[PDB]
Amino acid sequence: GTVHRWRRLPPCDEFVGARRSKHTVVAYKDAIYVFGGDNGKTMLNDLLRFDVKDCSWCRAFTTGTPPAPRYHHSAVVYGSSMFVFGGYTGDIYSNSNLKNKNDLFEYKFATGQWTEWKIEGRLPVARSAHGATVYSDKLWIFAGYDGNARLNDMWTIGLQDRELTCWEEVAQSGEIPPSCCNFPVAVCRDKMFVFSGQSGAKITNNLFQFEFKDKTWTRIPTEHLLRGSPPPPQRRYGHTMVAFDRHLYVFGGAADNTLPNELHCYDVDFQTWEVVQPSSDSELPSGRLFHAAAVISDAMYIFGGTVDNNIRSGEMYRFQFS
Amino acid sequence: NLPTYKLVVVGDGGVGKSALTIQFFQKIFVPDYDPTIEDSYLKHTEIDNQWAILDVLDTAGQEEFSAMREQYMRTGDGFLIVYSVTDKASFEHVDRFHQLILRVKDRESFPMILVANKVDLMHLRKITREQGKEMATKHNIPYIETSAKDPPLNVDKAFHDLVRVIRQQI
Ligand SMILES: Nc1nc2c(ncn2[C@@H]2O[C@H](COP(=O)(O)OP(=O)(O)O)[C@@H](O)[C@H]2O)c(=O)[nH]1
Ligand SMILES: [Mg+2]
């Protein structure tokens, strides 16, 4: 229970689910739900459940046909359901029938029910490695890779009535981030935050902030080295970022052909970066990318990813935020 | 109805993938391009009196593939395996890149061309022509010596020949 302490929680047993990367992790109640991913040989569409209170793994109860095995998809929790969107579908080993997706599946937590939201009308282009979050009773998906180029569009869909809902493209304003994919997204205060990612020639360590009300982006002027402030984290892709107590925590990812395991923290109010010093009794997680993160109570949870030598991981780590 | 050829430039860090791509597309030698930047280029060029769209991706980084890198590596029509004649390690890794393409493509053979770059650096050359030519005939793929430093050598031919290899299959 030591504060600011990494703790190596029990990994996902081999008979429960395969060690994976490019998966999605969502927090609900006192459990973490892992969906999709890449075990090193094939795509996945199982649903795992890590009970945080007693650290017990199990296959989550699922009825109905789940989404096609995929990775680089997004998952968000709205109300009592989890919403899967997008991703990369096909057969990895034989390199055939590969396509990005723009479908929408709902997983009802109380019943384990998989329902596909067959949305009518104009849909957002099928994409992978997009950003996604839930805000104001709507699913927001942003950027990604569509097959030919990176994206910088943004779409919303109301999650209130499956039959009475459709997609709407957001007329974004402000400094729209450069076309990006493989980046984490966190909502804090009433703003959505995006840090770095894979953006081609425009790959940087800029921090972007999207205020939902006026739908405007702002690249927070950071590295105020005039103030001697600690520098921003190195530019990276495949990293995770979570929000907790007016702070953003960035971990992992591939940064200039390395896998740093430093824990970076961004004070949203004071616009300052810092490296969180883990306690002496901490079990430091190894550098990884394409892992996944969620927050339960005052602790962050890291699952899976790809460590050095292209090795898939089933490890689960917990960092005590406070 | 114009044909599009997705070409991928792969190789060790520093062999000159960015230099070659920028030389081929922008007709300028750019020294010390950002080693981590990985982006794509587009032109409309006429090869053997036949117009074609060229979609080239300058690869970077050895960690897991970004969503863009992966889909390019899986759907690419041809690959340029590039090593530096001044970096013996890059030459020993030609085999590693060769196996990577076939493993991804799940094929016994795929359109590829071995590219020996930085040939202009003669005094510091480490890998000879017979060494590279043997490596190419070992993998049953063509061999081209290139230099992206002004004046460029076989930069246009290297990419064009890869297209020609693609056209003369199946
Ligand atoms: N002399 C010489 N240097 C080259 C050539 N091509 C690349 N370089 C140098 O090789 C280094 C790295 O090449 P770069 O363009 O970054 O390629 P990459 O690292 O393989 O993507 C830089 O210092 C370039 O100036 C070439 O044809 N001749
Ligand atoms: Mg480069």
CATH number of domain containing A178: 2.120.10.80
**A-B C-beta contacts closer than 8 Å:** 71
DSSP-derived letter for residue B131 is H
| CB B84 within 8 Å of CB B90 | yes
Q: How many domains does chain A have?
A: 1
| Closest residue by CA, ligand 1 atom 26 | B118
Name the nearest CA neighbour of B80 among B11, B152, B3: B11
Kindly give, in sequence order, each residue whose CB lies less than 8 Å from that of residue A149, ignoring residues fewer than 6 positions away.
Answer: A179, B40
SS3 B88: helix
The widest CA-to-CA distance across chain B, in whole angstroms, is 48
Whole-angstrom Cα distance, residue A117 to residue A121? Answer: 12
Domain that holds residue A44: 6-320
| CB A96 within 8 Å of CB A40 | no
| CB B160 within 8 Å of CB B129 | no
SS3 B115: strand
CA distances (Å), A175 to each of A139, A218, A220, A263, in order? 21, 6, 10, 27
| Closest residue by CA, ligand 1 atom 11 | B14
Residue A316 resides in a domain: yes
Chain B residues with at least one Cβ partner in A under 8 Å: 13, 35-40, 61-64, 66-68, 70-71, 74-75, 104-106
Quick one: how far is CA A123 from the chain centroid?
22
Would you tell me how many other CB atoms lie within 10 Å of the CB of residue A77? 17
Of all ligands present, the nearest one to the C-alpha of B9 is: 1
Q: Which amino acid is at A170?
A: V
Residue A1 resides in a domain: no
What distance, in Å, lies between the first and last C-alpha atoms of chain B? 20
Neighbouring-strand partners of residue A272: A267
Residue A185 resides in a domain: yes
Q: Which helix (H) or strand (E) holds B24?
A: helix B17-26
Is A238 in Cβ contact with B37 (below 8 Å)?
Answer: no
Whole-angstrom Cα distance, residue A197 to residue A254? Answer: 10
| Cα–ligand 1 centroid distance for B147 (angstroms) | 9
Name the nearest CA neighbour of A316 among A289, A292, A290: A292
Q: B56: nearest CA in chain A?
A: A148
Residue-range domains of chain B with CATH: 4-167 (3.40.50.300)
Is A289 in Cβ contact with B63 (below 8 Å)?
Answer: yes
User: Do β-strands A24-28 and A31-38 pair in parallel, antiparallel, or remain unpaired?
Assistant: antiparallel
Dihedral sign for Cα A270, A273, A276, A277, please. Answer: negative
Is A200 in Cβ contact with B39 (below 8 Å)?
Answer: yes
| Closest residue by CA, ligand 1 atom 19 | B14
Q: Which atom of ligand 1 is nearest to the CA of B117?
A: 27
H helical segments located in B59-154: 67-75, 88-92, 94-105, 129-139
Q: A99: nearest CA in chain B?
A: B71
Ligand 1 shell residues, CB under 6 Å: B 11, 13-19, 31-33, 35, 60, 117-118, 120-121, 147-149
For helices B94-105 and B129-139, the axis angle rounded to 10 degrees is 20
Report the gap between the CA of B108 and the closest CA in chain A (Å).
Answer: 12
DSSP-derived letter for residue B64 is S
